[PDB]
Protein backbone atom coordinates (compact mmCIF):
# COMPACT_ATOMS: atom_id res chain seq x y z
CA UNK A 1 0.00 0.00 0.00
CA UNK A 2 2.64 2.49 -1.08
CA UNK A 3 1.93 6.15 -1.85
CA UNK A 4 3.78 8.93 -3.62
CA UNK A 5 3.82 12.69 -4.01
CA UNK A 6 5.10 13.99 -7.30
CA UNK A 7 5.55 17.41 -8.87
CA UNK A 8 5.90 18.10 -12.58
CA UNK A 9 7.23 21.29 -14.14
CA UNK A 10 7.21 22.25 -17.79
CA UNK A 11 8.69 25.32 -19.43
CA UNK A 12 8.37 25.99 -23.14
CA UNK A 13 10.12 28.93 -24.76
CA UNK A 14 8.14 31.01 -27.23
CA UNK A 15 10.61 32.79 -29.57
CA UNK A 16 9.66 36.43 -30.13
CA UNK A 17 6.38 35.99 -28.26
CA UNK A 18 7.18 37.20 -24.75
CA UNK A 19 7.58 35.08 -21.63
CA UNK A 20 8.07 31.30 -21.72
CA UNK A 21 5.02 29.21 -20.89
CA UNK A 22 5.28 27.56 -17.48
CA UNK A 23 3.17 24.63 -16.28
CA UNK A 24 3.27 23.03 -12.84
CA UNK A 25 1.07 20.23 -11.51
CA UNK A 26 1.05 18.25 -8.28
CA UNK A 27 -0.04 14.65 -7.75
CA UNK A 28 -0.78 12.40 -4.84
CA UNK A 29 -0.60 8.99 -6.54
CA UNK A 30 -2.77 9.13 -9.67
CA UNK A 31 -4.68 12.13 -8.30
CA UNK A 32 -3.79 15.72 -9.20
CA UNK A 33 -4.30 18.22 -6.37
CA UNK A 34 -2.59 21.48 -7.39
CA UNK A 35 -1.56 23.40 -10.50
CA UNK A 36 -0.01 26.67 -11.61
CA UNK A 37 -0.23 28.15 -15.10
CA UNK A 38 1.68 31.31 -16.02
CA UNK A 39 -0.97 32.15 -18.63
CA UNK A 40 -3.93 31.95 -16.23
CA UNK A 41 -5.45 35.04 -14.62
CA UNK A 42 -5.11 34.11 -10.95
CA UNK A 43 -1.30 33.85 -11.03
CA UNK A 44 -1.44 31.62 -7.96
CA UNK A 45 -1.29 27.97 -6.98
CA UNK A 46 -4.73 26.55 -7.70
CA UNK A 47 -6.48 23.71 -5.89
CA UNK A 48 -7.54 20.77 -8.08
CA UNK A 49 -8.77 18.51 -5.28
CA UNK A 50 -11.45 19.10 -2.61
CA UNK A 51 -9.26 18.07 0.34
CA UNK A 52 -6.41 20.52 -0.32
CA UNK A 53 -8.81 23.47 -0.20
CA UNK A 54 -9.14 23.23 3.59
CA UNK A 55 -5.59 24.62 3.71
CA UNK A 56 -5.40 28.28 4.75
CA UNK A 57 -3.89 31.35 3.04
CA UNK A 58 -0.37 30.84 4.47
CA UNK A 59 -0.14 27.56 2.57
CA UNK A 60 -1.23 29.19 -0.68
CA UNK A 61 1.02 32.20 -0.10
CA UNK A 62 3.92 29.82 0.45
CA UNK A 63 3.20 27.66 -2.59
CA UNK A 64 2.65 30.62 -4.92
CA UNK A 65 5.97 32.09 -3.79
CA UNK A 66 7.88 28.85 -4.35
CA UNK A 67 6.23 28.02 -7.67
CA UNK A 68 7.07 31.52 -8.95
CA UNK A 69 10.67 30.98 -7.86
CA UNK A 70 10.57 27.69 -9.78
CA UNK A 71 9.43 29.46 -12.95
CA UNK A 72 12.08 32.15 -12.62
CA UNK A 73 14.94 29.64 -12.53
CA UNK A 74 13.49 27.72 -15.48
CA UNK A 75 13.06 30.94 -17.44
CA UNK A 76 16.80 31.54 -17.00
CA UNK A 77 17.45 27.84 -17.68
CA UNK A 78 16.10 28.15 -21.23
CA UNK A 79 18.53 30.97 -22.02
CA UNK A 80 21.47 29.15 -20.44
CA UNK A 81 20.72 25.78 -22.05
CA UNK A 82 20.36 27.33 -25.50
CA UNK A 83 23.93 28.51 -24.99
CA UNK A 84 25.27 25.17 -23.73
CA UNK A 85 24.08 23.42 -26.91
CA UNK A 86 24.85 26.34 -29.23
CA UNK A 87 21.31 26.79 -30.54
CA UNK A 88 19.80 29.87 -32.20
CA UNK A 89 17.02 32.02 -30.73
CA UNK A 90 14.78 31.11 -33.66
CA UNK A 91 13.29 27.92 -32.25
CA UNK A 92 11.14 26.79 -29.34
CA UNK A 93 12.58 24.52 -26.65
CA UNK A 94 11.41 22.61 -23.59
CA UNK A 95 12.79 22.02 -20.12
CA UNK A 96 11.15 19.68 -17.64
CA UNK A 97 11.68 18.93 -13.97
CA UNK A 98 10.09 16.28 -11.78
CA UNK A 99 10.62 15.36 -8.15
CA UNK A 100 8.98 13.82 -5.12
CA UNK A 101 8.97 10.94 -2.68
CA UNK A 102 7.45 7.52 -2.06
CA UNK A 103 6.29 6.10 1.25
CA UNK A 104 5.58 2.47 2.03
CA UNK A 105 2.40 0.91 3.41
CA UNK A 106 3.69 2.01 6.83
CA UNK A 107 4.06 5.61 5.58
CA UNK A 108 7.82 5.49 6.18
CA UNK A 109 10.19 6.99 3.61
CA UNK A 110 10.81 4.60 0.73
CA UNK A 111 12.53 6.38 -2.14
CA UNK A 112 13.21 9.80 -3.66
CA UNK A 113 13.33 11.39 -7.10
CA UNK A 114 14.62 14.46 -8.90
CA UNK A 115 15.17 14.61 -12.64
CA UNK A 116 15.75 17.27 -15.27
CA UNK A 117 15.27 17.12 -19.03
CA UNK A 118 16.01 19.37 -21.99
CA UNK A 119 13.95 18.85 -25.15
CA UNK A 120 12.62 15.57 -23.78
CA UNK A 121 16.03 13.99 -23.17
CA UNK A 122 17.69 13.11 -19.85
CA UNK A 123 19.84 16.08 -18.86
CA UNK A 124 20.86 15.71 -15.22
CA UNK A 125 19.41 13.49 -12.49
CA UNK A 126 19.83 12.80 -8.79
CA UNK A 127 20.98 9.21 -8.20
CA UNK A 128 19.11 6.86 -5.87
CA UNK A 129 21.28 7.58 -2.82
CA UNK A 130 20.27 11.25 -3.23
CA UNK A 131 23.93 12.24 -2.85
CA UNK A 132 25.25 12.42 -6.40
CA UNK A 133 24.23 13.32 -9.94
CA UNK A 134 23.90 11.51 -13.24
CA UNK A 135 24.90 13.80 -16.10
CA UNK A 136 24.34 12.72 -19.68
CA UNK A 137 26.44 14.63 -22.20
CA UNK A 138 29.23 17.23 -22.36
CA UNK A 139 26.85 20.11 -21.64
CA UNK A 140 25.26 18.66 -18.49
CA UNK A 141 28.69 18.28 -16.89
CA UNK A 142 28.99 22.03 -16.33
CA UNK A 143 25.67 22.08 -14.47
CA UNK A 144 26.91 19.09 -12.47
CA UNK A 145 30.02 20.92 -11.26
CA UNK A 146 27.98 24.00 -10.38
CA UNK A 147 25.36 22.02 -8.45
CA UNK A 148 27.98 19.91 -6.68
CA UNK A 149 29.73 23.04 -5.41
CA UNK A 150 26.44 24.65 -4.39
CA UNK A 151 25.52 21.54 -2.38
CA UNK A 152 22.21 21.15 -4.23
CA UNK A 153 22.06 17.41 -3.53
CA UNK A 154 22.24 17.94 0.24
CA UNK A 155 19.37 20.41 -0.01
CA UNK A 156 17.11 18.25 -2.18
CA UNK A 157 17.84 15.22 -0.02
CA UNK A 158 16.62 17.09 3.08
CA UNK A 159 13.39 18.02 1.31
CA UNK A 160 12.69 14.59 -0.19
CA UNK A 161 13.42 12.61 2.99
CA UNK A 162 11.77 15.22 5.20
CA UNK A 163 9.33 17.90 4.07
CA UNK A 164 8.08 15.88 1.10
CA UNK A 165 7.39 12.84 3.28
CA UNK A 166 5.84 14.75 6.19
CA UNK A 167 3.41 16.58 3.91
CA UNK A 168 2.62 13.48 1.84
CA UNK A 169 1.39 11.94 5.09
CA UNK A 170 -0.62 15.07 5.89
CA UNK A 171 -2.34 14.90 2.50
CA UNK A 172 -3.12 11.17 2.77
CA UNK A 173 -4.90 11.81 6.08
CA UNK A 174 -6.87 14.90 5.02
CA UNK A 175 -8.04 13.25 1.80
CA UNK A 176 -8.26 9.70 3.16
CA UNK A 177 -11.74 9.21 1.68
CA UNK A 178 -10.34 10.07 -1.74
CA UNK A 179 -6.80 8.73 -1.61
CA UNK A 180 -7.10 5.61 0.55
CA UNK A 181 -9.95 3.99 -1.34
CA UNK A 182 -10.02 0.80 -3.38
CA UNK A 183 -12.63 0.77 -6.12
CA UNK A 184 -12.65 -2.77 -7.46
CA UNK A 185 -12.97 -3.04 -11.24
CA UNK A 186 -16.40 -3.73 -12.69
CA UNK A 187 -15.86 -6.44 -15.29
CA UNK A 188 -17.71 -7.79 -18.33
CA UNK A 189 -16.81 -9.60 -21.56
CA UNK A 190 -17.46 -8.96 -25.26
CA UNK A 191 -17.63 -11.39 -28.21
CA UNK A 192 -17.34 -10.53 -31.91
CA UNK A 193 -16.57 -12.74 -34.91
CA UNK A 194 -13.69 -11.57 -37.09
CA UNK A 195 -14.00 -14.37 -39.64
CA UNK A 196 -15.90 -17.56 -40.45
CA UNK A 197 -13.40 -19.58 -38.39
CA UNK A 198 -12.18 -17.22 -35.66
CA UNK A 199 -13.59 -14.71 -33.17
CA UNK A 200 -12.42 -11.93 -30.84
CA UNK A 201 -12.80 -12.10 -27.07
CA UNK A 202 -12.43 -8.78 -25.23
CA UNK A 203 -12.12 -8.58 -21.44
CA UNK A 204 -13.15 -5.28 -19.84
CA UNK A 205 -12.06 -3.62 -16.60
CA UNK A 206 -13.93 -0.43 -15.74
CA UNK A 207 -14.31 2.12 -12.94
CA UNK A 208 -11.34 1.08 -10.81
CA UNK A 209 -8.84 2.91 -8.60
CA UNK A 210 -5.93 3.11 -8.43
CA UNK A 211 -4.62 2.69 -11.97
CA UNK A 212 -2.48 -0.38 -11.30
CA UNK A 213 -4.11 -3.49 -12.75
CA UNK A 214 -3.26 -6.79 -14.43
CA UNK A 215 -5.29 -8.22 -17.30
CA UNK A 216 -4.42 -11.72 -18.48
CA UNK A 217 -5.75 -14.18 -21.04
CA UNK A 218 -5.12 -17.88 -20.51
CA UNK A 219 -3.03 -10.67 -26.72
CA UNK A 220 -4.06 -7.15 -27.73
CA UNK A 221 -3.44 -4.80 -24.82
CA UNK A 222 -4.40 -1.12 -24.65
CA UNK A 223 -2.80 1.09 -22.01
CA UNK A 224 -4.77 2.03 -18.89
CA UNK A 225 -6.76 5.21 -19.47
CA UNK A 226 -8.60 7.68 -17.22
CA UNK A 227 -12.40 7.61 -17.14
CA UNK A 228 -12.55 11.33 -16.43
CA UNK A 229 -14.31 10.93 -13.08
CA UNK A 230 -11.27 9.80 -11.11
CA UNK A 231 -11.35 6.15 -12.16
CA UNK A 232 -9.62 4.13 -14.89
CA UNK A 233 -10.29 1.68 -17.72
CA UNK A 234 -8.48 -1.13 -19.49
CA UNK A 235 -9.17 -4.06 -21.80
CA UNK A 236 -7.37 -7.05 -23.31
CA UNK A 237 -8.26 -9.03 -26.42
CA UNK A 238 -7.49 -12.43 -27.92
CA UNK A 239 -8.24 -13.97 -31.30
CA UNK A 240 -9.84 -17.38 -30.80
CA UNK A 241 -10.87 -20.14 -33.22
CA UNK A 242 -14.68 -20.20 -33.33
CA UNK A 243 -16.21 -22.99 -31.26
CA UNK A 244 -13.28 -23.01 -28.84
CA UNK A 245 -14.46 -19.91 -26.94
CA UNK A 246 -14.88 -21.87 -23.69
CA UNK A 247 -11.18 -22.79 -23.50
CA UNK A 248 -10.12 -19.21 -22.75
CA UNK A 249 -10.25 -17.42 -19.40
CA UNK A 250 -9.58 -13.78 -18.54
CA UNK A 251 -7.84 -13.00 -15.25
CA UNK A 252 -8.10 -9.74 -13.34
CA UNK A 253 -5.75 -8.60 -10.57
CA UNK A 254 -6.32 -5.41 -8.58
CA UNK A 255 -5.89 -4.02 -5.05
CA UNK A 256 -9.64 -3.61 -4.58
CA UNK A 257 -10.25 -7.32 -5.12
CA UNK A 258 -10.11 -9.63 -2.09
CA UNK A 259 -9.30 -12.46 -4.50
CA UNK A 260 -8.52 -12.29 -8.26
CA UNK A 261 -11.41 -12.70 -10.72
CA UNK A 262 -11.70 -15.30 -13.47
CA UNK A 263 -13.94 -14.75 -16.50
CA UNK A 264 -14.68 -16.94 -19.50
CA UNK A 265 -17.22 -16.47 -22.30
CA UNK A 266 -20.59 -16.86 -20.60
CA UNK B 1 4.22 21.01 -0.74
CA UNK B 2 6.94 22.36 -3.04
CA UNK B 3 10.67 22.38 -2.36
CA UNK B 4 11.89 25.70 -0.98
CA UNK B 5 15.56 24.78 -1.29
CA UNK B 6 17.71 22.99 -3.86
CA UNK B 7 15.97 24.46 -6.88
CA UNK B 8 18.58 26.40 -8.85
CA UNK B 9 19.32 27.46 -12.40
CA UNK B 10 21.27 24.92 -14.45
Amino acid at each position, epitope marked *: GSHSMRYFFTSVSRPGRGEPRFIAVGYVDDTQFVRFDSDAASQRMEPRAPWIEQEGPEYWD*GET*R*KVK*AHS*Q*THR*VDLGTLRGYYNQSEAGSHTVQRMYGCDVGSDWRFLRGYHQYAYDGKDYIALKEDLRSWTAADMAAQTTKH*K*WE*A*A*H*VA*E*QL*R*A*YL*E*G*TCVEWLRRYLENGKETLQRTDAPKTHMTHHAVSDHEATLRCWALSFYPAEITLTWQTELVETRPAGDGTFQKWAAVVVPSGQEQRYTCHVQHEGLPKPLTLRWE | ELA*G*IG*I*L*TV
Partner: T-cell receptor
Amino acid sequence: EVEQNSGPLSVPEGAIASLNCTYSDRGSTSFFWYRQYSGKSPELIMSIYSNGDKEDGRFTAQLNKASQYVSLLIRDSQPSDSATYLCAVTKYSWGKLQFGAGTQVVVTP
Amino acid sequence: AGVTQTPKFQVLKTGQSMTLQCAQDMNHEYMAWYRQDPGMGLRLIHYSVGVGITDQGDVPDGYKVSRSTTEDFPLRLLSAAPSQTSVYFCASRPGWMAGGVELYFGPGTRLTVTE
Protein backbone atom coordinates in the same frame (compact mmCIF):
# COMPACT_ATOMS: atom_id res chain seq x y z
CA GLU C 1 13.43 34.70 16.94
CA VAL C 2 16.62 32.68 17.27
CA GLU C 3 17.67 31.97 20.84
CA GLN C 4 21.11 31.21 22.27
CA ASN C 5 22.65 31.12 25.74
CA SER C 6 25.20 33.93 26.00
CA GLY C 7 27.66 31.91 28.06
CA PRO C 8 30.53 32.06 28.33
CA LEU C 9 31.13 28.31 28.11
CA SER C 10 34.40 27.26 29.72
CA VAL C 11 35.78 24.11 28.10
CA PRO C 12 39.12 22.31 28.68
CA GLU C 13 41.47 21.69 25.75
CA GLY C 14 40.80 18.40 23.97
CA ALA C 15 37.29 18.16 25.40
CA ILE C 16 34.13 18.42 23.31
CA ALA C 17 32.38 21.79 23.18
CA SER C 18 28.59 21.60 23.19
CA LEU C 19 26.56 24.50 21.80
CA ASN C 20 22.87 24.63 21.00
CA CYS C 21 20.23 26.98 19.67
CA THR C 22 16.44 27.23 19.31
CA TYR C 23 14.23 28.86 16.67
CA SER C 24 10.52 29.66 16.57
CA ASP C 25 9.51 29.29 12.90
CA ARG C 26 8.72 25.61 12.30
CA GLY C 27 8.86 26.10 8.54
CA SER C 28 12.57 26.94 8.66
CA THR C 29 14.65 25.02 6.14
CA SER C 30 18.23 26.23 6.48
CA PHE C 31 20.41 26.25 9.58
CA PHE C 32 23.88 27.71 10.00
CA TRP C 33 26.64 28.26 12.54
CA TYR C 34 28.93 31.27 12.12
CA ARG C 35 32.16 31.76 14.03
CA GLN C 36 33.35 35.17 15.18
CA TYR C 37 36.73 35.70 16.81
CA SER C 38 36.78 38.70 19.14
CA GLY C 39 37.06 41.95 17.20
CA LYS C 40 36.72 40.12 13.89
CA SER C 41 34.10 39.16 11.32
CA PRO C 42 31.68 36.20 11.30
CA GLU C 43 32.61 33.31 9.03
CA LEU C 44 30.53 30.26 8.07
CA ILE C 45 31.83 26.98 9.49
CA MET C 46 28.74 24.73 9.31
CA SER C 47 25.44 24.36 7.47
CA ILE C 48 22.74 21.75 7.97
CA TYR C 49 19.34 20.94 6.43
CA SER C 50 18.27 17.39 7.37
CA ASN C 51 17.21 16.01 10.75
CA GLY C 52 19.97 14.14 12.54
CA ASP C 53 23.71 14.76 12.44
CA LYS C 54 26.13 16.27 9.95
CA GLU C 55 29.87 15.98 10.35
CA ASP C 56 32.59 18.21 8.91
CA GLY C 57 36.09 18.21 10.36
CA ARG C 58 36.11 18.79 14.11
CA PHE C 59 32.60 20.19 13.79
CA THR C 60 29.34 18.28 14.19
CA ALA C 61 25.94 19.88 13.73
CA GLN C 62 22.71 18.36 15.00
CA LEU C 63 19.20 19.31 13.94
CA ASN C 64 15.80 18.48 15.40
CA LYS C 65 12.99 20.18 13.47
CA ALA C 66 10.39 18.60 15.76
CA SER C 67 11.85 20.11 18.93
CA GLN C 68 13.14 23.08 16.93
CA TYR C 69 16.71 23.09 18.15
CA VAL C 70 20.09 22.97 16.45
CA SER C 71 23.38 22.01 18.03
CA LEU C 72 27.08 22.33 17.28
CA LEU C 73 29.77 20.04 18.65
CA ILE C 74 33.47 20.90 18.54
CA ARG C 75 35.79 17.91 18.96
CA ASP C 76 39.44 18.25 20.02
CA SER C 77 38.92 21.74 21.42
CA GLN C 78 41.87 24.11 21.06
CA PRO C 79 42.49 27.56 22.58
CA SER C 80 42.30 28.85 18.99
CA ASP C 81 38.63 27.80 19.02
CA SER C 82 37.87 30.46 21.63
CA ALA C 83 35.27 32.66 19.94
CA THR C 84 31.60 33.55 19.73
CA TYR C 85 29.47 31.11 17.76
CA LEU C 86 26.40 32.54 16.04
CA CYS C 87 23.32 30.48 15.17
CA ALA C 88 21.65 31.42 11.89
CA VAL C 89 18.24 30.36 10.58
CA THR C 90 16.28 31.07 7.39
CA LYS C 91 13.28 29.76 5.45
CA TYR C 92 13.81 28.98 1.75
CA SER C 93 16.83 30.02 -0.33
CA TRP C 94 15.61 33.62 -0.71
CA GLY C 95 14.57 33.99 2.92
CA LYS C 96 16.12 36.54 5.24
CA LEU C 97 18.78 35.15 7.56
CA GLN C 98 17.89 35.36 11.24
CA PHE C 99 20.81 35.57 13.69
CA GLY C 100 21.12 34.61 17.34
CA ALA C 101 23.16 36.63 19.82
CA GLY C 102 25.82 33.92 19.89
CA THR C 103 27.44 31.81 22.58
CA GLN C 104 30.98 32.65 23.65
CA VAL C 105 33.38 29.75 24.09
CA VAL C 106 36.60 29.95 26.10
CA VAL C 107 38.97 27.04 25.57
CA THR C 108 41.58 26.92 28.33
CA PRO C 109 45.13 25.55 27.77
CA ALA D 1 40.36 39.48 -1.96
CA GLY D 2 36.97 39.26 -0.27
CA VAL D 3 34.99 42.16 1.16
CA THR D 4 36.50 45.49 2.19
CA GLN D 5 35.03 48.23 4.38
CA THR D 6 36.17 51.81 5.03
CA PRO D 7 36.99 53.03 7.60
CA LYS D 8 37.50 50.35 10.26
CA PHE D 9 37.20 52.84 13.12
CA GLN D 10 35.32 56.13 13.34
CA VAL D 11 34.25 58.58 16.04
CA LEU D 12 31.42 60.99 15.26
CA LYS D 13 29.75 63.89 17.04
CA THR D 14 25.94 64.03 17.22
CA GLY D 15 24.45 65.43 14.01
CA GLN D 16 27.48 64.60 11.86
CA SER D 17 27.12 62.63 8.61
CA MET D 18 29.33 59.86 7.26
CA THR D 19 29.45 57.25 4.50
CA LEU D 20 30.74 53.73 5.16
CA GLN D 21 32.35 52.23 2.07
CA CYS D 22 31.91 48.58 1.14
CA ALA D 23 33.43 46.96 -1.92
CA GLN D 24 33.65 43.45 -3.33
CA ASP D 25 35.28 42.04 -6.46
CA MET D 26 33.60 38.64 -6.58
CA ASN D 27 30.71 39.76 -8.81
CA HIS D 28 28.20 39.03 -6.03
CA GLU D 29 24.67 40.13 -6.94
CA TYR D 30 23.62 40.29 -3.29
CA MET D 31 25.02 42.62 -0.63
CA ALA D 32 23.73 43.69 2.78
CA TRP D 33 24.49 45.79 5.84
CA TYR D 34 24.30 44.53 9.42
CA ARG D 35 24.87 46.11 12.82
CA GLN D 36 26.06 44.37 15.97
CA ASP D 37 25.29 45.70 19.44
CA PRO D 38 26.47 44.00 22.66
CA GLY D 39 24.05 41.19 23.48
CA MET D 40 21.74 41.32 20.46
CA GLY D 41 23.45 39.67 17.51
CA LEU D 42 23.01 40.79 13.93
CA ARG D 43 20.23 43.07 12.70
CA LEU D 44 19.72 43.71 8.99
CA ILE D 45 19.63 47.40 8.01
CA HIS D 46 19.49 47.40 4.21
CA TYR D 47 20.17 44.87 1.48
CA SER D 48 20.46 44.81 -2.30
CA VAL D 49 19.60 41.87 -4.55
CA GLY D 50 21.18 43.62 -7.53
CA VAL D 51 22.38 46.79 -9.24
CA GLY D 52 19.92 49.65 -8.74
CA ILE D 53 17.78 47.52 -6.44
CA THR D 54 17.75 47.98 -2.65
CA ASP D 55 15.22 47.40 0.13
CA GLN D 56 14.73 48.06 3.85
CA GLY D 57 15.92 45.63 6.52
CA ASP D 58 14.97 45.20 10.17
CA VAL D 59 16.21 48.65 11.21
CA PRO D 60 16.56 51.02 8.22
CA ASP D 61 15.72 54.35 9.90
CA GLY D 62 18.61 56.81 9.96
CA TYR D 63 20.42 55.05 7.12
CA LYS D 64 20.43 55.21 3.31
CA VAL D 65 22.06 52.95 0.71
CA SER D 66 22.71 52.97 -3.01
CA ARG D 67 23.84 50.37 -5.54
CA SER D 68 25.23 51.97 -8.70
CA THR D 69 27.56 49.09 -9.57
CA THR D 70 28.01 45.43 -8.68
CA GLU D 71 31.11 46.10 -6.56
CA ASP D 72 30.05 48.94 -4.27
CA PHE D 73 27.32 49.26 -1.65
CA PRO D 74 27.83 52.40 0.49
CA LEU D 75 25.91 53.10 3.72
CA ARG D 76 25.05 56.73 4.43
CA LEU D 77 24.44 57.98 7.96
CA LEU D 78 22.19 61.03 7.76
CA SER D 79 22.55 62.63 11.17
CA ALA D 80 24.56 60.55 13.64
CA ALA D 81 22.80 59.78 16.91
CA PRO D 82 24.16 57.98 20.01
CA SER D 83 21.82 55.06 19.27
CA GLN D 84 23.80 54.47 16.07
CA THR D 85 26.92 53.56 18.06
CA SER D 86 27.70 50.00 16.95
CA VAL D 87 29.82 47.72 14.77
CA TYR D 88 28.71 47.67 11.13
CA PHE D 89 29.29 44.66 8.88
CA CYS D 90 29.06 44.51 5.11
CA ALA D 91 28.29 41.11 3.60
CA SER D 92 27.87 39.63 0.12
CA ARG D 93 27.11 36.43 -1.80
CA PRO D 94 25.93 35.27 -5.22
CA GLY D 95 22.18 35.42 -5.81
CA TRP D 96 20.21 32.42 -4.57
CA MET D 97 19.36 31.16 -8.07
CA ALA D 98 23.09 30.76 -8.67
CA GLY D 99 23.56 28.87 -5.41
CA GLY D 100 24.48 31.69 -3.05
CA VAL D 101 24.11 30.70 0.59
CA GLU D 102 27.17 31.61 2.67
CA LEU D 103 27.45 35.29 3.59
CA TYR D 104 30.94 36.70 3.09
CA PHE D 105 31.55 39.42 5.68
CA GLY D 106 33.84 42.44 5.57
CA PRO D 107 36.23 43.37 8.42
CA GLY D 108 33.69 45.55 10.21
CA THR D 109 33.42 49.22 11.09
CA ARG D 110 33.43 50.25 14.72
CA LEU D 111 31.49 53.48 15.07
CA THR D 112 31.12 55.65 18.17
CA VAL D 113 28.74 58.60 18.39
CA THR D 114 29.61 60.94 21.24
CA GLU D 115 27.26 63.45 22.85
